[PDB]
């Protein structure tokens, strides 16, 4: 069973811009360059984000973490039973990712996905942020979340819930103009309100944004000013209606957006599915 | 599985009297008028109580909340297997209620019931009470409770426990005169001591009272004076023997009573069924 | 310096009525009869209330406690310097009161007052209430409080503040009819909001009421029913505006009233004098 | 000794605009109109802000609170010894302000000031905000603070510290252009970081802004959107360097600004005076 | 000003019996033998109890601790002003005691007393008890207490309070037969209820007993059995009325008794002097 | 009155070695270079340590912080009354130090000392350590401490206690060989066990070491390895007997040592002077 989103990889046209953006604006730690690409850390794990040179300027792959080898076997089995083409990653790929075992496949719309177990910890190389950030929230909640843009939400929903096992948290009916309302589905696989959201938005990218969660309000406020100085803010500070995250959005060098937030609420056993008509309680004024 | 009582609707002869009673006396928030009727809020949900014009001057319907679409399916199945006529609410009714999906049916004695999932939240329109009330207790405990008057308690008990899944908390042997003792059964579907109580009382209404729980003793004390000013108190302040709620009772414009309380105890896994011979430890002097 | 109100004595016409009232209705502990009269306890002290046969049917004397012999000396000196006639209680009186040393005198309007130190504790005879009461709040706050009725508030105020050292907490302008508004002054000598209140009320007694504070809301609720059964309630449950005490008032066999409350707020160093136009936030409906 | 800022009065050209601004945008409670003007509440006190019709469109007077009559006497004495013309407010003014006693005078630059004791509490009329606000922080910290604009900071400083007794918290060197740096002095009279700030800013008003502190971040976020809707924001959300308050600034109908914040730090006994070169850690982008 | 009882020395006829008693029965740590005698520890201090060979079989001297050299000077001055013969301990005595400075003198009835400052700590030699004891309570409360038997309580009281500065906690009227009642005075110099008690008991020793306080009830229970095995118990387990200590008493090899207790209450600023007629709430049955 | 040690300045022969040592080994933040020298931060203050090129390779000056201008005046007065030559720092020096006001003078043995008030805070430039360090403990405890080597301890003691106002915490008799025992005196001016220690050690430097305190054990462990890699450790990890600090010592490029520790205990009002015969409970093995 998938426990969390463990890592993500981006294929970008300007690797240098990304390196500077992630470290100096967002405060991630530069962890070196390997055949896996430029590596960035936010906690004890050897890397959480990989940046590789590429033409797409988008998310290249995402890795979901299981607890152990048995969990990996279960997922591989579940995918095969669903008719999905799964490939047991070879030692070379496993070594490149720094994991113990992994399987590779793609979602219904071509996003390369990986499920793995036994990632590398580097407690001996204590995390030191590239900018003043008190800390990132990961742990059992994993890396954070991202919104997957799809041409067909129902097909995407079936794959992610029925095959991958994500559970629905809530739905937000996004009013995009008078004759257009698009439902965005928020899914969880652990306590984090959502690790994945699905929506049929008309965008040139695989994802609308990815999100990183920090430990204090000041982390967000300081990062906002750093990003604003270069005119990269896309949405002002605000708080979401569903996860209650206080955040701002900014544009990465690839056009893909990043959400930087704090204080999200978690999902518990007493959770019930609900619907909303607005994605924000306050703030989040679009300055795009 | 039913998680809680989510909403209630009243069909009354004097809608204006009700509007003034709920907002000015009890402190509910007016949430507008729709084809669902005059809507009132007590928390983040779009509405909890609906008031419609009608001749019965009584509870018109009650909606029980399940966690998701699977839960709705389970309940529909359970009802069908019991031989109950269930109707899958159409999009029009679902839209009118502001829910994602729902099924409709009636209890053995004609009370229209609805089981739904995916109600609407309105965090962007922060709750502001119509009178000075610090807050209402809902959350996982739902709306509150009501006492269903029935001609046959055993038939009602079987339906609510065996078909709807409520569990018995305790029983109170109500001494109504020398030759009459009527057992009142208190049932729960979550932590709240009881979400439903059943008793064969000789009343012209479907329910004896509905109850709303507030956050502080002062909320109760202030509301008591507001209600008393118009001579609407039916029972003085007292504390119940079973749920330990400190409350007073008052008459609504429909004759149906409302209980306004604070500090009830909850039911846990170690709970055991017991019986009582009195419904109150102290207070609750009838001034009817 | 006066630390608290330590004990009170009543001279009543019906000693038996008082004994039954204090133990069975209020829950005090009967502590035996001596030359000091029928003694009642509420904590570890040998006695807090003494009931003696007498014609006045009123408060006969009150004893204020100092910390030690030096404190007694200070107060005696302060009184003498003010021209008050003070009498050093003799060993016989000290033994009768169960104290180590004491001085006697009277307030400007004839109420016998005593200031003493070294009262008797009886931890070896654990307190057992005469009725179901979880506990009384005394400790550093002392016995409770009483309202002294006087013909001239200014003269009384000067004596109690300038000579006895009480400090003003707040004032309540009591509206007693269209052409009459009487200010009631509330004074403290420790954390308890007020140990003494002064008002020019037209009453045949030295005090309007004395107050005892209990540990839980249920103590108050149960006592209310016990007292109400005999038709002795004078004011329904309510909460005061100044000390925030939740209480009810009842008539004692002498006509003097008793206030039985819970949850009063205390006075701290940041306290500032304020004024109120009402003595109650809610409740306290006079049923006299 | 001055314990806090207790109330403020504004003389404005558009009373209706102010009424709507304070209740609907900021969430204050309308408390009626008297010869003291339109009254607004934020807590248990009968009024904290008074709005009167007037030509200045500015702060008309401010009242500082002492603990009691002795404190009032001390301050009156201190002012007289300093050669300040003090007037003992007459019963008519005291009644108009709803206080027990007060003295009136002016600061060195003509701002009418009042020092009083024994203000009116109205616990019987529970605070109900005009907009969704969880609460305002007052208590021992008083009303909030305001920045007094003066032509000569040193003269103002001497009066406020040496005569009124305020203590310096810190100084911020405000860089207003290449050839201009103006020191702003922040003073406290209790735990609140500053109740008064003094700066020689070139403004047509007596004060730059007044500040109200709320209980949660959401109170600030929601109010920001309410104010922004009418285009009244003057500074975006940010956090100050000295008091660590998270706030935004907005324009009132008089041009005078209001700061609405949350989470300020307090001053303790271990506090030491420091200096800063910036008034904000992050945010507070001027949108004037 | 005396801060606490720091150490005690005994002059006994059977040093070996004492060594075995203190370590094996009470659990003290043997700290070696010096010209100061056999040393025993109960905490970080180099020694708290010294046992020397001697004929008296009693307390030979007690040392009271001041905070520093200034405190020592104050006490020396206070004693001289009282006409007491004080001797500044020489370097040889100071070195023998392991202190920085000390003065010697005697109480009115010949008990050698010492007031010192700058005792030796031995954190590098961690405390290891001679028997299973979780810990001893010392710290700011010092060593414990002892009861000084005197022929004249009033003379002793004057010396200890007026000259040494101890403060009275309470008094217990000890009923020793029909025609004899002896008051025992309990004095404190810090939070410990009493560091010294004075009573005119007819005993051949300078003290009735000394007391050591342990950290848990089991420490007391286990020690009781160890002592009882040798038939040395003098009083069964019980709890005192004044300090609320749960303890038992036992005979030392010198006839002098030792009290071993747990859970005593402390004295605070709100403390007031009281009197008791019994020294125990329960237990403490004399088995002498 | 001196509140704490605020800053220190070093005059060294190899500024580059120091820059690398402080940032890379100890984790301080580089704060730029000014006419005050290379500046390093450990908290919100603009700088705490200044490194200037110089021949002495030692501590050049230390600055003690007072709360305000009045405190500065008091100290200046105290020094003058003692016959010490004090110089009111001019605006140029004040600006160079980034303080509001300061006075300069020297200790009896030539160490330049400064007492100042109103240092600069830079909350807008959040602290970011040069190495992985969770945080430094400063606040009311100030910078840390240093041991001043002197030829005459008694003369130094008189100056620091009688003139500067430091209070003695404790003394450690340092056994330096058979015929040599040197007392080291530890003094405090706030909660930190000692801000200054004085000892007549035969060293070529003004100070034996300065100490910086970090927030966690791992901060110390990681720094130890960083320093050990270059063979700079002088004492292994250990814990002191007096302040209970867990620390290691290392050599700076000037030969002067630095102590890096965690978990020291503080001094409270109940503190009493004591003596020790060892400076360490465990560890601190000299590897010099
Ligand atoms: C668009 C959107 C809506 C709700 C929560 C989110 O985190 C989000 O990005
Ligand atoms: C009648 C009754 C009895 C017990 C608990 C209740 O809430 C109630 O209404
Ligand atoms: C009359 C009255 C008013 C305020 C507080 C009280 O306790 C009281 O008795
Ligand atoms: C201008 C300014 C600077 C610091 C704190 C404040 O509250 C403020 O208004
Ligand atoms: C005799 C006696 C009485 C009260 C407390 C004690 O500790 C004691 O020893
Ligand atoms: C030498 C020494 C002794 C005790 C505590 C210390 O911090 C220290 O440096
Ligand atoms: Fe789930
Ligand atoms: Fe998001
Ligand atoms: Fe159950
Ligand atoms: Fe009920
Ligand atoms: Fe007071
Ligand atoms: Fe009262
Ligand atoms: Fe201050
Ligand atoms: Fe401000
Ligand atoms: Fe005392
Ligand atoms: Fe004892
Ligand atoms: Fe000290
Ligand atoms: Fe050190």
């Amino acid at each position: 069973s998938i426990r969390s989103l463990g890592y993500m990889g981006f294929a970008v046209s300007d690797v240098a811009a990304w390196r500077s953006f992630l470290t100096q604006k967002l405060g991630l730690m530069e962890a070196g360059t390997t055949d896996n690409g430029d590596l960035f850390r936010i906690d004890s794990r050897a890397w959480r984000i990989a940046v590789q040179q590429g033409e797409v300027d988008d998310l290249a792959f995402a890795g979901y973490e299981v607890a152990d080898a048995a969990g990996l076997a279960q997922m591989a089995d579940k995918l095969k039973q669903a008719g999905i083409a799964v490939t047991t990653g070879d030692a070379s790929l496993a070594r490149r990712r720094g994991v113990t075992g992994l399987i590779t496949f793609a979602d219904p719309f071509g996003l390369p996905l990986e499920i793995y177990y036994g990632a590398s910890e580097v407690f001996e190389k204590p995390f030191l942020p590239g900018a003043a950030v008190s800390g990132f929230l990961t742990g059992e909640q994993g890396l954070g979340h991202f919104v997957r843009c799809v041409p067909d939400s129902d097909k995407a929903l079936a794959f992610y819930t029925d095959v991958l096992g994500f559970q629905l948290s809530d739905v937000i009916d996004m009013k995009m103009g008078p004759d257009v309302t698009v439902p965005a589905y928020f899914l969880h696989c652990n306590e984090r309100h959502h690790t994945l959201a699905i929506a049929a938005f008309p965008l040139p990218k695989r994802i609308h944004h990815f999100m990183l969660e920090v430990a204090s309000l000041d982390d967000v406020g300081f990062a906002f000013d750093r990003v604003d100085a270069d005119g990269l803010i896309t949405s002002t500070l605000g708080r979401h209606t569903n996860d209650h995250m206080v955040s701002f959005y900014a544009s990465t060098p690839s056009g893909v957006e990043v959400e930087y937030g704090w204080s999200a609420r978690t999902v518990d056993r007493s959770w019930v599915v609900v619907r909303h008509d607005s994605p924000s309680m306050w703030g989040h004024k679009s300055v795009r």
Side-chain angles (χ1 to χ4, degrees), chain A residues 1 36 40 45 58 114 130 151 175 185 221 231 239 252 278 286:
Chain A
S1 308
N36 194 44
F40 299 84
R45 293 298 174 80
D58 202 348
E114 304 177 351
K175 297 184 176 179
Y185 302 94
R239 196 202 285 266
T252 66
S278 296
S286 182

Side-chain angles (χ1 to χ4, degrees), chain A residues 170-232:
Chain A
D170 44 49
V171 185
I172 297 187
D173 282 315
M174 302 291 296
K175 297 184 176 179
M176 289 156 45
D179 221 304
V180 190
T181 290
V182 172
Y185 302 94
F186 300 78
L187 314 159
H188 63 264
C189 59
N190 54 48
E191 279 197 335
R192 191 183 287 287
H193 179 270
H194 64 285
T195 288
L196 175 70
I198 289 168
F201 291 152
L203 292 183
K205 304 298 183 182
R206 292 167 161 164
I207 58 169
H208 168 243
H209 69 273
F210 63 103
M211 180 283 303
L212 293 176
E213 188 173 1
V214 289
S216 81
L217 174 59
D218 290 325
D219 293 331
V220 183
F222 279 122
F224 184 100
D225 281 3
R226 292 195 299 264
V227 171
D228 194 39
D230 288 1
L232 301 173

Side-chain angles (χ1 to χ4, degrees), chain A residues 44-283:
Chain A
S44 60
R45 293 298 174 80
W47 65 286
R48 286 290 194 173
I49 293 183
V51 177
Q52 316 169 333
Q53 202 284 305
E55 320 303 271
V56 305
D57 261 317
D58 202 348
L59 179 70
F61 60 88
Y64 288 110
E65 182 171 294
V66 289
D68 51 36
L72 189 59
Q74 291 180 328
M75 294 310 300
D77 183 64
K78 206 172 179 178
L79 291 163
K80 290 185 298 178
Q81 288 301 280
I84 308 292
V86 188
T87 297
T88 308
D90 87 294
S92 180
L93 183 59
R95 290 182 183 112
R96 176 179 297 106
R97 298 291 192 247
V99 303
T100 304
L102 81 164
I103 58 181
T104 55
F105 57 102
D107 81 353
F109 309 104
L111 175 69
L113 294 179
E114 304 177 351
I115 289 179
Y116 71 90
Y117 83 96
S120 298
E121 293 280 26
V122 295
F123 286 108
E124 69 275 26
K125 295 174 182 182
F127 173 70
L128 179 59
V133 183
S134 76
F136 288 89
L137 252 85
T138 52
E140 59 184 304
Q141 292 186 38
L143 179 47
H145 70 236
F146 63 73
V147 179
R148 178 72 169 109
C149 295
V150 293
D152 181 357
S153 284
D154 302 309
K155 187 178 175 193
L157 259 188
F159 174 78
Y160 284 103
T161 60
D162 305 325
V163 184
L164 290 194
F166 284 84
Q167 297 309 296
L168 185 70
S169 296
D170 44 49
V171 185
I172 297 187
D173 282 315
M174 302 291 296
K175 297 184 176 179
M176 289 156 45
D179 221 304
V180 190
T181 290
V182 172
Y185 302 94
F186 300 78
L187 314 159
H188 63 264
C189 59
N190 54 48
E191 279 197 335
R192 191 183 287 287
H193 179 270
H194 64 285
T195 288
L196 175 70
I198 289 168
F201 291 152
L203 292 183
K205 304 298 183 182
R206 292 167 161 164
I207 58 169
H208 168 243
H209 69 273
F210 63 103
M211 180 283 303
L212 293 176
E213 188 173 1
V214 289
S216 81
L217 174 59
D218 290 325
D219 293 331
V220 183
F222 279 122
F224 184 100
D225 281 3
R226 292 195 299 264
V227 171
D228 194 39
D230 288 1
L232 301 173
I233 298 292
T234 51
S235 280
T236 60
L237 275 162
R239 196 202 285 266
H240 288 299
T241 48
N242 61 347
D243 68 2
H244 297 180
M245 168 141 287
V246 173
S247 65
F248 70 82
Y249 289 71
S251 195
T252 66
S254 300
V256 164
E257 290 186 54
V258 60
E259 175 181 16
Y260 203 79
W262 162 79
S263 202
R265 69 173 167 167
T266 51
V267 166
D268 83 302
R269 291 180 173 108
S270 72
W271 184 268
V272 302
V273 173
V274 291
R275 64 172 299 292
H276 304 258
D277 281 294
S278 296
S280 302
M281 293 183 203
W282 51 263

